[PDB]
Structure formats: C-alpha cells, structure tokens
Design a protein around this ligand. Sequence first.
Ligand SMILES: NC(=O)c1ccc[n+]([C@@H]2O[C@H](COP(=O)([O-])OP(=O)(O)OC[C@H]3O[C@@H](n4cnc5c(N)ncnc54)[C@H](OP(=O)(O)O)[C@@H]3O)[C@@H](O)[C@H]2O)c1
Ligand SMILES: Cc1noc(C)c1COc1ccccc1C(=O)Nc1cccc(Cl)c1
Length: 314
Amino acid sequence: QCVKLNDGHFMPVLGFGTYAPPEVPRSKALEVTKLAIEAGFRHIDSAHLYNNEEQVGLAIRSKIADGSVKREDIFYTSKLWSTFHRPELVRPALENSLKKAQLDYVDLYLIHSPMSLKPGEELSPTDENGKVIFDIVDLCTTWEAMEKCKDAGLAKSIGVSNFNRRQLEMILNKPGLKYKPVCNQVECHPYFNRSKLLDFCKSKDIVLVAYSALGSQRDKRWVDPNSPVLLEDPVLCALAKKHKRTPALIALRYQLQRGVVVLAKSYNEQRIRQNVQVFEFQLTAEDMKAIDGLDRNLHYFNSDSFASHPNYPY
Ligand SMILES: NC(=O)c1ccc[n+]([C@@H]2O[C@H](COP(=O)([O-])OP(=O)(O)OC[C@H]3O[C@@H](n4cnc5c(N)ncnc54)[C@H](OP(=O)(O)O)[C@@H]3O)[C@@H](O)[C@H]2O)c1
Ligand SMILES: Cc1noc(C)c1COc1ccccc1C(=O)Nc1cccc(Cl)c1
C-alpha cells in the first residue's frame, strides 16, 4: 500500500510516528517500534531531534534479524535538524544518524525545518538572555548538500518538512537542481488541512506527509490546553459511530482519501494495532466534505519565540 515518489522509489502511505517527550523512557521507543512493525507498519518516522534513533534502529534491525521483515520492506525516515543547515554539516549529521541507528542508508532524509538555528551540540542554542539564537543560511546550499547525500547513497530519497509554498518554490526554482523534494512533511489534520498547500504539492509531484493527523500530543511546552482536542470533535465522533470505528481512524482515513500520506504516533499497543485498520473501511463523499468543513486553520504548534525568524513557514 504505497505511493510512487518522483524519484522512482515507493513510500508506504501509512507511517509510524516515533516521537515521545523526553519524560518517556528511551526503552519505550524500542518496544513500540517492534509492535508497530508486527502490527503492519513499514513506514517509520524518526529524526535526530527525537533522541531515539538507536532504539528505533535497533527495533528495525531486530525485526530484520528474527526474519519478520527485510530491509527493503522498511521505509525508515530521519530528519536533518536546524542546527546543521550549513552545507558542510549535512553529511556528518546523516552519517551520525546512520551510525546511531546502525543502518547503511535511510529511505528518506528530510530538512526538518526552514528556521535555521546556530550550529552546535545544543538542539536549541540560547544566548545570555535565554532567547533562541537564529542563523542565516541560504537553504538552497543546504539542499545541495542534501542532494550529494543521495548521490553518496546514504539517502534513497530526500525531501523537506514544514515548508510553505514560497519556501518550496525556492528549492524548485534552484539553478542546477538535480533532485526535487520527494515530499513535504507538514502539520495536517481536519482542523488544519493544508488544502491550498496540498494542491500545490500535487501540482509538483510532491507528496504531502501529514504529521499531527490525530491532533498532536498536546505537549505543555508547545500547545495551549484550551485548544480544541481533535479527537473530541462531534463530527469525527459521529462518523466513528456510523462506520463502527474510532475518531482517530476517521482522521487517518480522511488523509488517505485525499492523496495525503499520513503519520500516526502511538506508544499504546492496542492503539498501535488499532491504527493499521484504516485500510479496512472507506469514507463516503458526504463524510469527506463533512470533515472538509472542520478546517479552522489551527496550528497546534504555536511559538512566538519562533515567530521572528525570517524563514518561519506560516
Ligand atoms: N516534521 C515535523 O516537524 C514533525 C513535527 C511533529 C511530529 N512529527 C512526527 O509525526 C509523528 C506523529 O505526530 P504527533 O507527534 O503530533 O502525534 P499524533 O499522530 O498526532 O497522535 C496524537 C496522540 O493521539 C494518540 N493516539 C494514537 N493513536 C490513537 C488512536 N487510534 N486513538 C486515539 N488516540 C490515539 C496518541 O497517544 P498514545 O501514544 O497514548 O496512543 C498520540 O499521542 C511524530 O511522532 C513525529 O515523528 C514531525
Ligand atoms: C512549523 C515548524 N517548523 O519547524 C518545525 C519543527 C515545526 C513544527 O514543530 C512542531 C510540530 C508539532 C509538535 C512539535 C513541534 C516542535 O517541537 N517544534 C519545534 C520547533 C523549533 C524548535 C524545536 Cl526544539 C521544536
């Protein structure tokens, strides 16, 4: 169950989200990634930011080793963090992510954010006054370093994440371009459905990948507790009763039926197993336009600290 990418390789349309807050013990990312693979996931979304590539790579390496799966069956994804946007820091970051996860290549390497941060070992550098230190980098130079990684064979496909239309065209309107981004991974869910951005990506053979499709983890550091909880929407709860399903399954099927590759994080065995069942039912045209009307342009990620960056995507 995949969608062909604009460089030839294939991406499973349902992916597993591996991020959990640092409060969650690192051993969990190993247990739930194996359970996700046993449940039927073959697309695994990770990143250098999530501090989990060893447990994730170990789980992948262990399911390959016990004979459940082979390396070609697994679509593994990592992301270049924003402190590594200077072109010389790109390949060492990917090799470090490969060394950490113990894989010879990633199926997908993404530019995690367009908001470049100052290079360093800190995932978020902060100055004297406790504010985040930005950095100015021409992102097309970063993409060239990304392109070389695909040539080197460390990344089967390369793409971006949290890129708006203007930032996407900057990559497409790049001189000497060799590989267009196979995908743009952005926040997408019935309350914020990226309809105009999805049309643009469709018009460029670029796959839109939805993160926070279930309505996000609502971490206290980045989300307002008064913001609407997507899985409590009366419309989503109503359709789940009609189809005898769950509100999460309604949200996941919503993206799968408009050409969106959808991610879903879960560290709960039953909900992990519950999410693969999105392929067992279908939404009607009436159900699709009912969810269509829920768009209220709601960013679950909100950060005024990152509102002053020249490349902030929204
Ligand atoms: N490119 C980027 O900038 C970016 C940003 C954010 C996230 N991501 C990636 O996208 C992945 C998913 O996004 P997300 O972190 O916002 O989480 P999410 O997919 O929106 O899920 C939100 C919450 O819903 C719960 N859940 C999972 N399955 C459920 C089900 N069947 N029914 C009810 N609840 C369910 C989960 O809690 P339980 O664990 O308890 O089940 C989960 O924490 C992340 O893991 C990350 O890899 C990428
Ligand atoms: C927009 C956008 N542009 O880049 C990113 C990444 C995003 C979305 O970010 C999130 C979405 C969902 C949940 C969490 C996050 C997040 O934790 N962002 C973050 C941003 C900057 C620094 C650091 Cl440390 C974290």
